[PDB]
A and B are shown apart, each in its own frame.
Chain A
Amino acid sequence: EIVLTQSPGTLSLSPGERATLSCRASQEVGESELAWYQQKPGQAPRLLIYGAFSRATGIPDRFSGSGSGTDFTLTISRLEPEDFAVYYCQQYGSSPWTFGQGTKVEIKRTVAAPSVFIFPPSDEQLKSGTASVVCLLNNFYPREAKVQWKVDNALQSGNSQESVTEQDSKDSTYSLSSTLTLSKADYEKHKVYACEVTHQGLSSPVTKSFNRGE
């Protein structure tokens, strides 16, 4: 099976820049029987380039393909706002048809630190046996951020779950939600609940915290 390795995983460029995407193959590929697909969130993929360098119908000229053998490259000559999306390479000349894992082209904007908020478990949820503590990281960039939960200063493992928003359409930022899940019994045996956030835009990790019952 011809394994296709794309690189980099993410391209952080500002609109109008030139984007260069790479796709390397575990073995020699057909006779440039390589294609590139574009995919925006919630849509199917659409063919951009086939035969390494030929454009599918209706695909603008800024997209261009080059390469040969095991080394292929997709070039976007000037990024328009609709080009920020995920791109897959594909070998289609022999079975199994194989795809790369995809390069994501995202908007580079200025650094923005997250605004942090912590939410205690609702009273009705406690009334039902479980407690969820939600920590919000709002409108930040870049995507990398660490969240560390601290129950009575003891930091936790295995009982939180992160989920990140897609890059915001208007201001190109992200938002993250970490939810911490305990039993009601467990929640009621500690006092201080704290969310500690690390981010490029923060000089020092910001901690938001609360006490049970306030």
Chain B
Amino acid sequence: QVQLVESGGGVVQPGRSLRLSCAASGFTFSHYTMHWVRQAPGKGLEWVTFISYDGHNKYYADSVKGRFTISRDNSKNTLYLQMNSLRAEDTAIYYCARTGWLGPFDYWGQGTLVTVSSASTKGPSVFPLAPSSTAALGCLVKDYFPEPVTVSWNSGALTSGVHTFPAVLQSSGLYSLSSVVTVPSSSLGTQTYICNVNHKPSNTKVDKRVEP
């Protein structure tokens, strides 16, 4: 079964380097050309680089020419992307993809996230969005870095009517999102509502109450 499994994603400060690796299983790696393709948050696909069968022909997108290097170890069945002089605009999910014998990108890896930013790893602050006087409440997940953060309500017991928004990148260089839920107003003195924030990068869990 054809499979591409990427690794190496992480945070980088601008100007530095990072190397992604893509591990290919399920086919004779040396008979296919490979590419990297990236997707910045919220945008479409951008082809990054191409490498021939033997590795002696490489092509690059203009936006990364002179900075990135593609290469392959056919003996280890592995594809690499060496990124140098990294810029903030290079932040994206980076996909590894295989060229079909007839041209198209027929198999794709799962993608790895690369965040290029001076900002420092930081667990989030969680503030309650208290219900006023069916009603809505939430959690403001503020100034964390980097993505991703994950929010559950009542440790998974509360799901219907939850809306965990996509994060936005503040000008502080730190991320922030909100997760809200709507609930019957009557259960507001009965039921008790906790949001569980997990930020794996900083290894921080925060549980917060929302009360009226």
Contact = CB atoms under 8 A, between A and B. Distances in A.
B45 interface: yes
Interface string B99-117: 0101111101111000000
B59 A45 contact: no
A96 interface: yes
Contacts of B129: 119, 122, 134
B177 A163 contact: yes
B152 to A, nearest CB: 16
B180 A163 contact: no
Interface stretch (B23-31, B163-171, B188-196): B163-171
Given A50-B102, A51-B102, A165 B166 contact: yes
A73 interface: no
A204 interface: no
Given A44-B108, A47-B105, A134-B178, A122 B128 contact: yes
B44 to A, nearest CB: 5
Interface in A2-51: 33, 35, 37, 44-47, 50-51
B51 to A, nearest CB: 12
A203 interface: no
Contacts of A99: 44-47
Contacts of B138: 119, 134, 136
Contacts of B136: 115, 117, 136, 138
Contacts of B105: 35, 37, 45, 47, 90, 92
Contact of A56 (B62, B106, B170): B106
Interface in B160-212: 163, 165-168, 170, 176-178, 180, 182
Given A96-B47, A177-B165, A132 B103 contact: no
How many B residues touch the partner, as a band? 35 or more
A92 B44 contact: no
Contacts of B182: 115, 138
Contact of B163 (A93, A102, A138): A138
A125 B44 contact: no
Interface in A86-118: 88, 90, 92-93, 95-102, 115, 117-118
Prevailing SS type, chain A contact patch: strand
Contacts, number: 119
Contacts of A128: 125
- Mostly, the B contact residues are strand
Given A95-B50, A122-B127, A163-B177, A50 B104 contact: yes
A132 B104 contact: no
Contacts of A134: 129, 138, 140, 178
A50 to B, nearest CB: 4
B142 A132 contact: yes
B75 interface: no
Nearest to B6: A44
Nearest to B107: A47
B201 to A, nearest CB: 18
A166 to B, nearest CB: 8
B145 interface: no
A100 B44 contact: yes
B72 interface: no
A46 B45 contact: no
6 contacts: A51-B102, A90-B45, A92-B103, A99-B47, A101-B44, A134-B129
Interface of A: 33, 35, 37, 44-47, 50-51, 56, 88, 90, 92-93, 95-102, 115, 117-119, 121-122, 124-125, 128, 132, 134, 136, 138, 161, 163-165, 175, 177, 179, 181, 210
CB-CB nearest 8 A-B residue pairs: A35-B104, A50-B104, A122-B127, A97-B47, A44-B108, A119-B129, A175-B163, A163-B165
